[PDB]
Design a protein around this ligand. Sequence first.
Ligand SMILES: C[C@@H]1CCO[C@H]2Cn3cc(C(=O)NCc4ccc(F)cc4F)c(=O)c(O)c3C(=O)N12
Ligand SMILES: C[C@@H]1CCO[C@H]2Cn3cc(C(=O)NCc4ccc(F)cc4F)c(=O)c(O)c3C(=O)N12
Ligand SMILES: [Mg+2]
Ligand SMILES: [Mg+2]
Ligand SMILES: [Mg+2]
Ligand SMILES: [Mg+2]
Ligand SMILES: [Zn+2]
Ligand SMILES: [Zn+2]
Lengths: 47, 47, 261, 242, 261, 242, 66, 66
Amino acid sequence: NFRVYYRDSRDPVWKGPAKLLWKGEGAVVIQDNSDIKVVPRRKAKII
Amino acid sequence: NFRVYYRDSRDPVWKGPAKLLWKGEGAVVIQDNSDIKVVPRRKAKII
Amino acid sequence: FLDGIDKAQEEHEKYHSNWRAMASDFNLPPVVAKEIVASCDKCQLKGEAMHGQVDCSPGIWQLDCTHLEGKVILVAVHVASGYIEAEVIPAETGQETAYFLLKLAGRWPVKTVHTDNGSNFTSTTVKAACWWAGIKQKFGIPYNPQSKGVIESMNKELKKIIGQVRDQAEHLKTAVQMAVFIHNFKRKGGIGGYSAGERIVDIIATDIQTKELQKQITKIQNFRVYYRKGPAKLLWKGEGAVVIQDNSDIKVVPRRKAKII
Amino acid sequence: LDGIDKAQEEHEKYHSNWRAMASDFNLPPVVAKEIVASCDKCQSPGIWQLDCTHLEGKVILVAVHVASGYIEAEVIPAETGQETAYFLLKLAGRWPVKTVHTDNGSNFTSTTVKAACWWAGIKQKFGVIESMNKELKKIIGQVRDQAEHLKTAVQMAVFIHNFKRKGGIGGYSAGERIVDIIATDIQTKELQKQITKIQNFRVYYRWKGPAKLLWKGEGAVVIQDNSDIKVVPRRKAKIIRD
Amino acid sequence: FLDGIDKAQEEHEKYHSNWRAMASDFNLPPVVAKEIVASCDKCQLKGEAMHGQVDCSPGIWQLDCTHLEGKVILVAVHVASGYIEAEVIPAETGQETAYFLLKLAGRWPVKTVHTDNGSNFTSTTVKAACWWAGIKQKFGIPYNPQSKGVIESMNKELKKIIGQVRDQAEHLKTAVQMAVFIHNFKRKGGIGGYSAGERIVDIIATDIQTKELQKQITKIQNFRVYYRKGPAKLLWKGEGAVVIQDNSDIKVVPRRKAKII
Amino acid sequence: LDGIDKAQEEHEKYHSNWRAMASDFNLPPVVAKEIVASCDKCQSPGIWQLDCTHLEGKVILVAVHVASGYIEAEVIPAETGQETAYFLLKLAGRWPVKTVHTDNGSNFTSTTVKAACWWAGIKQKFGVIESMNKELKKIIGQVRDQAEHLKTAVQMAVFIHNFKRKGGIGGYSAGERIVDIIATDIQTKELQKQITKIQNFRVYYRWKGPAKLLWKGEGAVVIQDNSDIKVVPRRKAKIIRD
Amino acid sequence: ELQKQITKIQNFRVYYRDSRDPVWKGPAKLLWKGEGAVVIQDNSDIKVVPRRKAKIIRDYGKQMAG
Amino acid sequence: ELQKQITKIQNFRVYYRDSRDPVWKGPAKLLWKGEGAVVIQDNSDIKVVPRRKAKIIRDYGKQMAG
DNA sequence: CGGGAAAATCTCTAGCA
DNA sequence: ACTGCTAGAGATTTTCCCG
DNA sequence: CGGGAAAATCTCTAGCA
DNA sequence: ACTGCTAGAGATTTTCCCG
Ligand SMILES: C[C@@H]1CCO[C@H]2Cn3cc(C(=O)NCc4ccc(F)cc4F)c(=O)c(O)c3C(=O)N12
Ligand SMILES: C[C@@H]1CCO[C@H]2Cn3cc(C(=O)NCc4ccc(F)cc4F)c(=O)c(O)c3C(=O)N12
Ligand SMILES: [Mg+2]
Ligand SMILES: [Mg+2]
Ligand SMILES: [Mg+2]
Ligand SMILES: [Mg+2]
Ligand SMILES: [Zn+2]
Ligand SMILES: [Zn+2]
């Protein structure tokens, strides 16, 4: 599996780790504490 | 001679034409109605 | 360096050293230093250094609102051509957005709309209007104007032309319509040296024409190809290459090891 | 190139147009247009028709692209020159509008409508609009119950007419037809541009007299001398501007 | 096209058409279309698409103030190395800026300072302090933070490290000093895989050493060179090339057509 | 490479250090350091000295880099551990501070100063500082009239001492000297890194027994066998990790 | 009959992009068109392109210049 | 005497930029240094560089790895 | 000389507000 | 007469290690 | 085949707020 | 499961025009 770290939409603080649920060209889908979220790959890091 | 057109520091409206007084790498020195001004070449156009 | 990793760990627990500092100092391999930095949550602070690519299928429009002199200008762009349609509306409300979209879809073929999450767009009215006229609503990632870069740049350009012409009109709505005319027919460039109006006409006519031609080809050209595997429909062949579609998976294979029946 | 004589024979047998030659025997469009223009015996997309309609005590402004029957309509607050002018300015910024045909009225014969027409480069001229207003009203009645305010029913009828009704030769919508007509018109204007570009030159070949330049390619130069199109190699010809 | 230019002029007086639209439509040469656009004041709306380059001589520092949790952090960077010095001050005043600069110039060799035009920097106090310690004050173009890009990026980086360490300290000033330590000694990269502390030491020692070596060479190596022209001091020679300095104008000439005396 | 024997003879004649060999006969520093380390008969930059001084009813914190005499000073509100710790944390983030030598006092022997020393990796130890405080006070008196508040005169005296006074061997400032000393120290730590890297390998050449790897180049491998440095071609040698 | 269709499809110009390159790649040459993928010819190199990334035109213009 | 000085100047590495390129150009080789211009050797190509654009170091770690 | 692996170099982004 | 930069994250291209 | 001139292509920026 | 873009301004590199 992968850990995801991500800037949320407006908040400047980086959150994570979250699970990777889906990876596209341009965006990812992550799960952080039962909270599905869609983040730009610009605002996210997958390990 | 050259005409200069330039965004001033903060105002979004483009002014000009002004005379070229000096041209450097990165900035120009212009005269617009007896008002010497130093503009970035990013914010200016010389014709 | 088995001993240094422990020292590099306790140190990073304090200074959070990049991988190079720890590799230099505690004499660790680059992979081990990178592994130490990689497991610290307090150092995962930067995203990927790329950009996505927005969709450009001939049926997708990007809509946004924008503000100029106290008024709300509602703007659409056809993504593939750059063709804009704008209008000074009196309020960023769902009623004025659903009416604008109903007019757009009655003029041009609109399949998908891409907007941000402003309320006028996430309305039940805009939704029932899109439903009535078979339009699919895409919402970008919240607070990601990059997902709508086309319409955002067109906001920039529309407002630049509006500034150029504003003195030729009394009211803002007239300036706005003149700027739409000017962007659509008086500015040439892009892929075919086109104006946005000509370019959209080309994109729509080409779409119609090629869909027709292909319906005809596939009605006539009926073949099954075996390559390397099972049967596969033949798409196009030529110049020592035979593009086929097997199990909804298009692939190009060389002419050898490929028999047509 | 080699089939120019065949194209010339074709035109003398069926009087077909330049597009047919260009699609069949593979010729540049200027050369086909020249072949079709050499026989004297062988000798719209921008006109809109405007009119107002009244419905349930409100006025609908209707513009019909005559060549296609494509319709653009909206409800307007009042039959004024301001509203007719704003309508016209919207229409011309969205479709190439060259000429508007209106009835003798006030809104249409107004200095503000005239000023909008002048700013947009539109010429004015004072039974299509009537029949297509009838069809508009029919659709507006067919869908009235699906919308509270009248303007929504007017735009729903515009949608249905432009895209859900189908007829004619091969069953196309008004949107399909206007797109094809405007596309043909862009082709036409482009070929006119190419002619207007090349007709300002003269060619000298093998020297012989002056000869009109038609096409200019990689290893050939198609010209015209004494009403007879002829191909010469580029190295053996000289092109000047006059 | 002499006739079209008049039509292209009246049209541009209305729509302001880019050069491509007018060239396409009125059949004008590209140079003539560009000349029409070029003489309309209402179309000169975009600057040059480049960036300048900030000075990086070993004696120039960039100073800025920045804000974090209600406090004012005064920051300096040595441009050539990336070496930072910061301090939570109680007020963006000239007194607290002149005292900070007096301390910097007593620790490191400071020749020029580059700041924006905020009041703390354009003070008479900062000016008399810079005068006392022979420092030259450069002020960038007003509202051009690009001229101070180095210190601005260092603001970004300082605040990132401060966020990483903030929980290890009670007060902000302690977090700030720890972040200065961390940036100066616990982050390696750049030109010589250095930390900013090592890099500044190298830049200063190299400057001292090479100035000395050259004083010695020029005291020993005394020659006049004639090339192509008059006499010219010889700077360095080798590998079929002889760099000379004539009339305060350095030039490299090939070994041929150049005689040393 | 060829002059390794000459360097060996040189060390047996004048007992010069590895830097001399590396600068003279052009040898990698690890090989020169090995040559200088093979003779038993031939066998600071991070120490600071802290102390407080009192002047006109205010306390000055003074830190002197002993190897150079470079001084860092400021006025502090009070002789507390908080202020000594904040001073120390500033000093270590700006100069590489390994060891601080203080007198037996309160501020210096405090859990907060101890915590700052521990966070920054500084060792503590409880007539240089006295003389250089005297010189500091002399300059502070020389410039007092040029500044109203005492802290400005303290920083002006710091400036003058670190950069306007000159003495010693060739007349350098304390800033010049500390920069050279820290630069030598970075060189030293780098050579120590290179040794600590290479000494984890063994070499087999021509096979013979194990041999310590010294330098590894493009077309040569300098090793050491039986206390005798020897050069072998790379193709004829094999390097492993142990 | 059919070859006319193939060559006419062939006259249509395809601008397109790849996964990470923001620059649009010069007019290729349309070989086949489907509901979601386009098959083109870019400098004697056959590529398949997602529909969502390909703008297809005729270049009325290049065409009337031949 | 003098050649030692020349080669020692020669050991110093020069990073530098040109007029419109934001990228720093890899270590050249210091040939001469003046109050405002630096003369370097960048891949057997002698250039003169404004001082304000050149960062000059030794690379203490390259030097001690020889 | 040649793959595989490692390292160096290149490309590109956010934030500095 | 003055001027975007920095440091990390993936991608690409050199460099190296031994058969 | 070869310079010179023109055109096409490349590189890069602000604003969208 | 989604995604920066656009149009102009200088710079650079192809393409062309005729000796
Ligand atoms: C309340 C709705 C919904 C939720 O969010 C807000 C706020 N917002 C902010 C911007 C904006 O920041 N544009 C600057 C920009 C920056 C980068 C880039 F690539 C493109 C760009 F346009 C918009 O454009 C926009 O339409 C909105 C909006 O509509 N809303
Ligand atoms: C009152 C003083 C003097 C006059 O102007 C103001 C306002 N200002 C604004 C920014 C700012 O907008 N930073 C964002 C940014 C954008 C682009 C870029 F390349 C670098 C960047 F930092 C500053 O950083 C800053 O120090 C000030 C300041 O000090 N002042
Ligand atoms: Mg919006
Ligand atoms: Mg927006
Ligand atoms: Mg500031
Ligand atoms: Mg700032
Ligand atoms: Zn960490
Ligand atoms: Zn204009």
